[PDB]
Amino acid sequence: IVGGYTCGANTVPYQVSLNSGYHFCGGSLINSQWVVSAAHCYKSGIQVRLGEDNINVVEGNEQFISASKSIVHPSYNSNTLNNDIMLIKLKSAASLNSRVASISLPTSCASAGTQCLISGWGNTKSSGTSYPDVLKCLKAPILSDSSCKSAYPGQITSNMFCAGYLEGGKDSCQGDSGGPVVCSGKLQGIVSWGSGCAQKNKPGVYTKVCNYVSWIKQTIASN
Ligand SMILES: NCCc1c[nH]c2ccc(O)cc12
Ligand SMILES: [Ca+2]
């Protein structure tokens, strides 16, 4: 997260770190046994780390649970990033509490102008690299689809939205991939892609979660 702030330990209780020897992506806990992330975060050997603040220090609220199954969206295209969503099932149910809690799926899509919270352990620099240990947060509005399409000609599908600041300086970044965009207590977006981070006229692009709720629910119901 570039241009954000330190969230505060366990203040984003649905935020997970996906770990394969090291943090490599975010995700969102959506029930005791399932995480939603980006398809571009797919790999084998995932351990889901819940209850994290400092990802390099055991602070006492963590739950580490291996993935038993990953399901990349059937229509994910890794070249265009269309349908950039994946589900991860945990080998055992997480113990839900104030610091490890699921985030509600949307029943309605969100509109341009809605304020959201974006979070992760990604790079905090727009030029250069610095990776934080503690979770970072950014409040950002959803941008109009027309401004999103104008910012990224030929690239924005109906499964994507932009959020952030056209003036630059505030954005998600590398390592925030797969993490949440939460608006009014609902998971509306997943950190997906962009042209660099926090660049003028190049806001972050996010998977439009509301389009996937039916797929998520039916997938959970049979897996
Ligand atoms: N807005 C963050 C988009 C994003 C996701 N993964 C990334 C990796 C590198 C980068 O410059 C940007 C990204
Ligand atoms: Ca920790």
DSSP string, 139-196: EEEBPPHHHHHHHSTTT--TTEEEES-TTSS-B--TT-TT-EEEETTEEEEEEEE-SS
Nearest CA to ligand 1 atom 8: 174
Backbone angles phi, psi at 150, to 5 degrees: -65, -35
Q: Is 167 annotated as a binding residue?
A: no
Q: Is 111 annotated as a binding residue?
A: no
Q: Find the 166 Cα to ligand 2 centroid distance in Å.
A: 34
Going 5 to 10 to 14 to 17, the CA torsion angle's sign is: positive
- Ion ligand 2 neighbours, Cβ < 5 Å: 52, 54, 59
23 catalytic residue (yes or no): no
Q: Rounded to whole angstroms, how far apart are CA atoms 187 and 30?
A: 9
CATH value of 5-7+103-211 in 2.40.10.10, 1.20.120.420, 3.40.50.1820, 2.60.40.420: 2.40.10.10
Phi-psi region of 169 (alpha: psi -120 to 50; beta: other; left: phi over 0): left
Cα Rg of the chain, angstroms:
16
Containing 119, the helix (H) or strand (E) segment is strand 115-120
Q: Rounded to whole angstroms, how far apart are CA atoms 52 and 119?
A: 12
- List all residues whose CB is within 6 A of at least one atom of ligand 1: 171-174, 176-177, 191, 193-194, 196-197, 204
Contacts of 1 (CB under 8 A, 6+ apart): 118, 119, 120, 122, 124, 136, 137, 138, 171, 172, 173, 176
Nearest CA to ligand 1 atom 6: 174
Report the amino acid identity of residue 215. Answer: W
In the chain, domain spans: 5-7+103-211, 15-102+212-222
Beta-bridged to residue 5, according to DSSP, are 137
115 to each of 107, 110, 136, 157, 184, how far by Cα in Å? Answer: 17, 10, 17, 21, 8
Catalytic hit among 17, 119, 177, 192: 177
Three-state secondary-structure class, residue 205: strand
Report the amino acid identity of residue 206. Answer: Y
| 7, 13 Cβ separation under 8 angstroms | no
Q: Rounded to whole angstroms, how far apart are CA atoms 51 and 60?
A: 8
Phi-psi region of 33 (alpha: psi -120 to 50; beta: other; left: phi over 0): alpha
Record the tokens describing residue 141, joined without a space: 């509005």
Catalytic hit among 17, 28, 53, 84: 84
Q: How many CA atoms lie within 13 A of 196 on its CB side?
A: 14
Domains 5-7+103-211 and 15-102+212-222 share a fold: yes
Provide the Cα torsion 157, 153, 78, 121; round to 10°. Answer: -90
Q: Is 60 annotated as a binding residue?
A: no
Q: Find the 199 Cα to ligand 2 centroid distance in Å.
A: 31
Q: Is 97 annotated as a binding residue?
A: no
55 to each of 24, 26, 30, 82, how far by Cα in Å? Answer: 11, 12, 21, 30
For the domain spanning 15-102+212-222, the CATH number is 2.40.10.10
133 catalytic residue (yes or no): no
Q: Rounded to whole angstroms, how far apart are CA atoms 33 and 107?
A: 20
3-state secondary structure 27-73: EEEEECCEEEECHHHCCCCCEEEECCCCCCCCCCCCEEEEEEEEEEC
Q: Rounded to whole angstroms, how far apart are CA atoms 102 and 30?
A: 5
27 to each of 76, 166, 201, how far by Cα in Å? Answer: 17, 25, 26
Which of 29, 21, 63, 81 has its CA nearest to residue 46? Answer: 21
73 catalytic residue (yes or no): no
The approach used to solve this structure was X-ray
Q: How many CA atoms lie within 13 A of 118 on its CB side?
A: 33
Beta-bridged to residue 191, according to DSSP, are 206
